[PDB]
């Protein structure tokens, strides 16, 4: 080349301003930051703004976004909920694709037997162009 | 023989302990035998030298 | 766990009236639990039985700051099939009971030693990093630690999938 | 359209039991998607059959059902406990069940 | 104690290039290339100078962050090969018969078959290994000269030939007949 | 947890007596089945061990007939179709009825190269053997007891993946083609729509 190269291996770090998808318990599916961070298994998460106290969490418990933000550690839950505005979080997530991928499913079962049938017929609608389309 | 040769192959055959328990032709400087036959024993001497 | 305090007179004798009272930390699954280990705990330091004596107060202490992750020094007398030692483990946990649970949990998976062989006879969260002498706690003291969780994987909840598992992460 | 249930696909389990000994009153009843009692409550109540054919047209229909119904939860996995109005036949473990969505709410 | 993170750091010279994706390893440089699967280990490489890499494991026990620098220096060995290739002097040790060795090539593969080895009649064929050349030291008499880019390769072809003269029943204290080892090293010279 | 009429899994990866141990409630609960590949099963275990293991059945028989005694398949195929047959009350007839929705190959045999498999995953051996934890591969194991067929099975593979792959560029080509569209449809009502139902 002559460059080298190596892969390399990217990661999601479980470090200090990771935000996290919370799996399983009372939160259940909430972003919360990691603010200090105990060991392996073991982390402390707070997202005031979703509203998921603060708590040590196992991290098995809990799942990494992509997202990170500024976060001092140590952080309390005021200070945390200060500089998650300034970096934006919530509306980072929002645009994620994970995050529409959520909303989307929550929004299909949320949906009547009416309106699941107009997906049949506008699903429907949608075949037509497009199998016109493939012949074209 | 020459005996830079010899003190080569000496190297290579005499210059070694040996573990007492399981008689393992064993690395001088080891501390413990390798095989796990005898439980790793620290029970060692050195391979006897000619004459 | 909680972790009790347990306040003790022994009894009211004629003669000696208001006796000296006595106060554990006692970390206990409960009031009755507590209670027995304060005398248990007792009957090892004086001549009073919880028949020829009384508690005076159960009181469960909470961790003043429970959200705070924190160094916690622990002494452990432990009774071995053999001899019984002293210890000194430490532990980052963030309250003394989830450190004092977890210890039992690290002493019965270290040395089998059972909840009714281990005493915990001090504990002490630890404010300079440096007297956090294991180096097992000292892993996670570091100036910015960032870590990953490589090999990550996934519970389905159905018996089969189609898409072949990751553990991207 | 090509579909038509209006019920449920279930297969049928076990009898209830202990290492040893059964008890053919109660059968287990698997539920399809069901995994957890939390999802399989639903199904509390709801009818069941087990229909199954035959070589007689006993009553203008070669075919046959057994009525039933689940009475609860089983575990933590979604199997649901089902007391036949006659109990299930032991040649139906793994057999196809209709559970039902009447007695509906 | 489970170490939370370990790296080793290895410095790639000027001259080569080492190409890592998953884990394998084509490192190429002036005497040629060699490849290396280390798939068996699960570290992490990570480029960072275009002469460096930190090859790290991340919650390794005893076992792994051992395991992390092994990798290291085989790959640290990879690189010395592909520059400074591998040079293994063998001897010919020997009271009274000589062992007369030859590079004789049957089906284009190259066998050092040993011969009037302690007056044994029989041939004792040893097989030269992909990528190993065999040379015959010119001026130091009784002496063979493996030299290759893999170490792993060269050093265990040279052990080949050594065991290949091992002296059975015999006491070996007093027949040191056999091909020895005297000088692993490198085939660029000033260094 | 669905109701399929055969289900076919793609052995490959699995650890065994998991697959294994799972593949036999799928069949005393009607499921049907149909390993293929099994010349891949991972079992835990150390090569070396897991063929001492079989070098400790390979040795039991009826002393006396040394036929009737227990018949030690080397079949990888077989191999994980005992561990079963062996997880199974199979003698009791609602145990044959099992062991008969259960068939079992290696590499993949016709009417089934055809059909998605599917991959129990709380099998797989990179969901569980803890990372480093040596593991093996029936497909060897086997092959060093007797096995006749892997080098002929190694054979009738590629051969195999080869069309299954050159069978997965007309499947692309037909599709990001059909993904050109999507969006010459996209953004119209038809959508804006659907694109809220759901
Ligand atoms: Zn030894």
């Given at each position: 080349?002559?460059?080298?190269?190596?892969?390399?291996?990217?990661?999601?770090?479980?470090?200090?301003?990771?935000?996290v998808?919370v799996?399983?318990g009372?939160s259940?599916?909430?972003?919360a930051?990691i603010?200090?961070?105990?060991?392996?298994?073991r982390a402390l998460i707070?997202?005031?703004?979703?509203?998921?106290?603060?708590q040590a969490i196992n991290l098995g418990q809990v799942?990494?976004?992509?997202?990170?933000?500024?976060?001092?550690?140590?952080?309390?839950?005021?200070?945390?909920?200060?500089?998650?505005?300034?970096?934006?979080?919530?509306?980072?997530?929002?645009?994620?694709?994970?995050?529409?991928?959520?909303?989307?499913?929550?929004?299909?079962?949320?949906?009547?037997?009416?309106?699941?049938?107009?997906?049949?017929?506008?699903?429907?609608?949608?075949?037509?162009?497009?199998?016109?389309?493939?012949?074209? | 023989?020459?005996?830079?040769?010899?003190?080569?192959?000496?190297?290579?055959?005499?210059?070694?302990?040996?573990?007492?328990?399981?008689?393992?032709?064993?690395?001088?400087?080891?501390?413990?035998?390798?095989?796990?036959?005898?439980?790793?024993?620290?029970?060692?001497?050195?391979?006897?030298?000619?004459? | 766990?909680?972790?009790?305090?347990?306040?003790?007179?022994?009894?009211?004798?004629?003669?000696?009236?208001?006796?000296?009272?006595?106060?554990?930390?006692?970390?206990?699954?409960?009031?009755?639990?507590?209670?027995?280990?304060?005398?248990?705990?007792?009957?090892?330091?004086?001549?009073?039985?919880?028949?020829?004596?009384?508690?005076?107060?159960?009181?469960?202490?909470?961790?003043?700051?429970?959200?705070?992750?924190?160094?916690?020094?622990?002494?452990?007398?432990?009774?071995?099939?053999?001899?019984?030692?002293?210890?000194?483990?430490?532990?980052?946990?963030?309250?003394?009971?989830?450190?004092?649970?977890?210890?039992?949990?690290?002493?019965?998976?270290?040395?089998?030693?059972?909840?009714?062989?281990?005493?915990?006879?001090?504990?002490?969260?630890?404010?300079?990093?440096?007297?956090?002498?294991?180096?097992?706690?000292?892993?996670?003291?570091?100036?910015?630690?960032?870590?990953?969780?490589?090999?990550?994987?996934?519970?389905?909840?159905?018996?089969?999938?189609?898409?072949?598992?990751?553990?991207?992460? | 359209?090509?579909?038509?249930?209006?019920?449920?696909?279930?297969?049928?389990?076990?009898?209830?039991?202990?290492?040893?000994?059964?008890?053919?009153?109660?059968?287990?009843?698997?539920?399809?998607?069901?995994?957890?009692?939390?999802?399989?409550?639903?199904?509390?109540?709801?009818?069941?059959?087990?229909?199954?054919?035959?070589?007689?047209?006993?009553?203008?229909?070669?075919?046959?059902?057994?009525?039933?119904?689940?009475?609860?939860?089983?575990?933590?996995?979604?199997?649901?406990?089902?007391?036949?109005?006659?109990?299930?036949?032991?040649?139906?473990?793994?057999?196809?069940?209709?559970?039902?969505?009447?007695?509906?709410? | 104690?489970?170490?939370?993170?370990?790296?080793?750091?290895?410095?790639?010279?000027?001259?080569?290039?080492?190409?890592?994706?998953?884990?394998?390893?084509?490192?190429?440089?002036?005497?040629?290339?060699?490849?290396?699967?280390?798939?068996?280990?699960?570290?992490?490489?990570?480029?960072?100078?275009?002469?460096?890499?930190?090859?790290?494991?991340?919650?390794?026990?005893?076992?792994?962050?051992?395991?992390?620098?092994?990798?290291?220096?085989?790959?640290?060995?990879?690189?010395?090969?592909?520059?400074?290739?591998?040079?293994?002097?063998?001897?010919?040790?020997?009271?009274?018969?000589?062992?007369?060795?030859?590079?004789?090539?049957?089906?284009?593969?190259?066998?050092?078959?040993?011969?009037?080895?302690?007056?044994?009649?029989?041939?004792?064929?040893?097989?030269?290994?992909?990528?190993?050349?065999?040379?015959?030291?010119?001026?130091?008499?009784?002496?063979?000269?493996?030299?290759?880019?893999?170490?792993?390769?060269?050093?265990?072809?040279?052990?080949?030939?050594?065991?290949?003269?091992?002296?059975?029943?015999?006491?070996?204290?007093?027949?040191?007949?056999?091909?020895?080892?005297?000088?692993?090293?490198?085939?660029?010279?000033?260094? | 947890?669905?109701?399929?009429?055969?289900?076919?899994?793609?052995?490959?990866?699995?650890?065994?007596?998991?697959?294994?141990?799972?593949?036999?409630?799928?069949?005393?609960?009607?499921?049907?089945?149909?390993?293929?590949?099994?010349?891949?099963?991972?079992?835990?275990?150390?090569?070396?061990?897991?063929?001492?293991?079989?070098?400790?059945?390979?040795?039991?028989?009826?002393?006396?007939?040394?036929?009737?005694?227990?018949?030690?398949?080397?079949?990888?195929?077989?191999?994980?179709?005992?561990?079963?047959?062996?997880?199974?009350?199979?003698?009791?007839?609602?145990?044959?009825?099992?062991?008969?929705?259960?068939?079992?190959?290696?590499?993949?045999?016709?009417?089934?190269?055809?059909?998605?498999?599917?991959?129990?995953?709380?099998?797989?051996?990179?969901?569980?053997?803890?990372?480093?934890?040596?593991?093996?591969?029936?497909?060897?194991?086997?092959?060093?007891?007797?096995?006749?067929?892997?080098?002929?099975?190694?054979?009738?593979?590629?051969?195999?993946?080869?069309?299954?792959?050159?069978?997965?560029?007309?499947?692309?080509?037909?599709?990001?083609?059909?993904?050109?569209?999507?969006?010459?449809?996209?953004?119209?009502?038809?959508?804006?729509?659907?694109?809220?139902?759901?």
């Amino acid at each position: 080349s002559t460059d080298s190269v190596v892969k390399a291996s990217n990661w999601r770090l479980v470090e200090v301003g990771r935000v996290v998808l919370v799996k399983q318990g009372q939160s259940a599916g909430k972003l919360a930051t990691i603010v200090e961070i105990i060991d392996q298994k073991r982390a402390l998460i707070d997202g005031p703004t979703t509203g998921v106290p603060r708590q040590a969490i196992n991290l098995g418990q809990v799942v990494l976004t992509p997202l990170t933000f500024a976060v001092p550690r140590g952080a309390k839950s005021a200070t945390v909920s200060k500089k998650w505005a300034a970096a934006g979080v919530s509306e980072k997530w929002a645009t994620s694709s994970w995050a529409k991928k959520i909303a989307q499913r929550e929004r299909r079962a949320a949906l009547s037997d009416f309106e699941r049938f107009q997906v049949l017929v506008l699903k429907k609608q949608k075949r037509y162009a497009v199998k016109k389309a493939v012949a074209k | 023989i020459e005996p830079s040769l010899k003190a080569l192959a000496s190297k290579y055959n005499c210059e070694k302990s040996v573990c007492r328990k399981c008689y393992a032709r064993l690395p001088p400087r080891a501390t413990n035998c390798r095989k796990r036959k005898c439980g790793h024993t620290n029970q060692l001497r050195p391979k006897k030298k000619l004459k | 766990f909680k972790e009790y305090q347990v306040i003790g007179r022994r009894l009211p004798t004629e003669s000696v009236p208001e006796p000296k009272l006595f106060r554990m930390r006692i970390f206990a699954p409960n009031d009755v639990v507590a209670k027995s280990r304060y005398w248990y705990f007792l009957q090892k330091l004086h001549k009073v039985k919880k028949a020829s004596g009384e508690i005076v107060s159960l009181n469960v202490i909470s961790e003043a700051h429970p959200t705070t992750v924190k160094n916690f020094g622990v002494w452990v007398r432990y009774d071995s099939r053999s001899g019984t030692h002293n210890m000194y483990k430490e532990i980052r946990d963030v309250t003394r009971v989830g450190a004092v649970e977890s210890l039992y949990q690290d002493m019965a998976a270290r040395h089998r030693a059972r909840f009714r062989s281990i005493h915990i006879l001090k504990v002490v969260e630890l404010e300079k990093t440096a007297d956090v002498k294991r180096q097992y706690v000292k892993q996670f003291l570091t100036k910015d630690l960032k870590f990953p969780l490589p090999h990550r994987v996934q519970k389905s909840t159905k018996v089969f999938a189609y898409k072949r598992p990751t553990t991207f992460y | 359209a090509e579909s038509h249930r209006l019920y449920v696909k279930g297969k049928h389990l076990s009898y209830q039991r202990s290492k040893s000994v059964n008890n053919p009153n109660v059968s287990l009843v698997k539920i399809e998607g069901v995994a957890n009692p939390e999802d399989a409550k639903f199904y509390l109540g709801k009818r069941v059959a087990y229909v199954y054919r035959c070589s007689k047209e006993v009553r203008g229909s070669k075919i046959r059902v057994i009525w039933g119904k689940i009475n609860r939860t089983h575990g933590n996995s979604g199997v649901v406990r089902a007391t036949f109005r006659s109990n299930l036949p032991a040649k139906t473990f793994g057999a196809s069940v209709r559970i039902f969505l009447y007695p509906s709410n | 104690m489970k170490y939370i993170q370990t790296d080793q750091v290895l410095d790639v010279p000027e001259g080569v290039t080492v190409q890592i994706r998953s884990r394998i390893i084509k490192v190429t440089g002036p005497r040629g290339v060699l490849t290396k699967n280390l798939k068996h280990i699960d570290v992490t490489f990570t480029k960072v100078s275009n002469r460096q890499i930190k090859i790290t494991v991340h919650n390794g026990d005893r076992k792994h962050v051992a395991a992390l620098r092994t990798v290291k220096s085989l790959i640290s060995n990879l690189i010395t090969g592909v520059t400074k290739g591998y040079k293994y002097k063998l001897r010919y040790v020997y009271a009274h018969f000589p062992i007369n060795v030859n590079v004789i090539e049957k089906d284009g593969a190259k066998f050092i078959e040993i011969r009037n080895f302690l007056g044994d009649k029989k041939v004792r064929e040893v097989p030269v290994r992909e990528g190993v050349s065999v040379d015959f030291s010119t001026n130091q008499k009784d002496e063979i000269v493996l030299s290759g880019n893999s170490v792993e390769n060269v050093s265990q072809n040279a052990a080949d030939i050594q065991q290949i003269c091992r002296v059975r029943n015999k006491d070996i204290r007093k027949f040191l007949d056999g091909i020895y080892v005297s000088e692993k090293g490198l085939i660029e010279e000033e260094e | 947890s669905s109701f399929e009429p055969v289900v076919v899994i793609d052995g490959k990866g699995h650890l065994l007596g998991r697959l294994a141990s799972t593949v036999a409630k799928q069949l005393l609960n009607g499921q049907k089945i149909v390993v293929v590949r099994a010349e891949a099963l991972n079992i835990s275990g150390e090569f070396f061990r897991n063929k001492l293991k079989y070098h400790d059945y390979l040795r039991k028989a009826t002393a006396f007939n040394k036929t009737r005694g227990p018949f030690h398949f080397r079949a990888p195929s077989r191999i994980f179709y005992k561990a079963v047959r062996g997880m199974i009350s199979h003698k009791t007839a609602r145990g044959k009825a099992a062991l008969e929705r259960l068939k079992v190959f290696e590499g993949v045999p016709p009417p089934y190269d055809k059909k998605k498999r599917v991959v129990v995953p709380q099998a797989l051996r990179v969901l569980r053997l803890k990372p480093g934890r040596k593991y093996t591969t029936l497909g060897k194991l086997s092959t060093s007891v007797g096995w006749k067929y892997e080098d002929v099975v190694a054979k009738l593979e590629e051969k195999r993946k080869a069309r299954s792959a050159e069978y997965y560029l007309k499947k692309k080509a037909y599709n990001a083609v059909v993904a050109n569209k999507s969006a010459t449809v996209g953004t119209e009502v038809s959508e804006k729509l659907a694109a809220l139902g759901y």
